[PDB]
């Protein structure tokens, strides 16, 4: 039997699924540790590896990329879980190794690849404490080219009065995503700052794991794919909307929570964003 992770229902994805909107023909790139393409609950359409020692993008030695990918697009069938946009075209852009780290050069190569391959939506559930002109340029180019770029805000929690949002989430062109639990409370780990845009479920998220498994993970890494998935549903409904329009709609129809420094605009609601 298939189970629907709490987070999927919390952002109101099932309402669209019911209407026949599931992300068909929307190309979503998961820039992460790869995706196990052998998992029976995922369908990988393509991708590329930018990790010099791990050339197959379809082998996930970490487990993180696979878990993120399932939140976006675990298939609607009779097994496992259900993603936010189960009919999307999923691309594994491998830029992290088995240990979950990666060089900026690799990440940027992955972004360049996504632009050139006409991805509609980019998901980056990764972050570093420092930026670079090259990192900023790549994300800015993707947005200028019409791509929706979503990133995890970071797991740094609070720090006096400063922003703890990492890069690339800090860049204005990117949608920076913080995490809430099932009760809509901000997770204590979720990074904070004026750059935070939206929140999504990120505590104990059940998703796919390599080797035909399923398990829960917590983090703003788990939050970001709910938003990437959300963008894919919107585009399946409104194929001629620009990335700007998709983004404004998501931001403009959230359920407001606390202060923007901690919650951004609040929790996304895809049903309201889809008009
Ligand atoms: Ca399934
Ligand atoms: Ca922002």
UniProtKB/Swiss-Prot annotation:
GO terms for biological process: fibrinolysis; proteolysis; sporulation resulting in formation of a cellular spore. Its cofactor is Ca(2+). Completely inhibited by phenylmethylsulfony fluoride (PMSF) and partially inhibited by benzamidine hydrochloride, leupeptin, and pepstatin A. Used as a detergent protease. Sold under the name Alcalase by Novozymes. It comes from Bacillus amyloliquefaciens. This is Subtilisin BPN'. GO terms for molecular function: metal ion binding; serine-type endopeptidase activity. It comes from the Bacteria. One of its GO terms (cellular component) is extracellular region. Its EC number is 3.4.21.62. It is found in: Secreted. The chain holds residues 108 to 382 of 382 of the full protein. Binds 2 calcium ions per subunit. Optimum pH is 9.0. Residues 5-274 form the Peptidase S8 domain. The lineage of its organism: Bacteria, Bacillati, Bacillota, Bacilli, Bacillales. The keyword Cell wall biogenesis/degradation does not apply. Monomer. Secretion of subtilisin is associated with onset of sporulation, and many mutations which block sporulation at early stages affect expression levels of subtilisin. However, subtilisin is not necessary for normal sporulation. Belongs to the peptidase S8 family. Changing residue 21 to F: In strain: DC-4. Transmembrane segments: none annotated. Its main location: secreted. It is an enzyme of class 3 (hydrolase). Subtilisin is an extracellular alkaline serine protease, it catalyzes the hydrolysis of proteins and peptide amides. Has a high substrate specificity to fibrin. It catalyses: Hydrolysis of proteins with broad specificity for peptide bonds, and a preference for a large uncharged residue in P1. Hydrolyzes peptide amides. Ca(2+) 2 binds at residues 169, 171, 174. Ca(2+) 1 binds at residues 2, 41, 75, 77, 79, 81. Optimum temperature is 48 degrees Celsius.
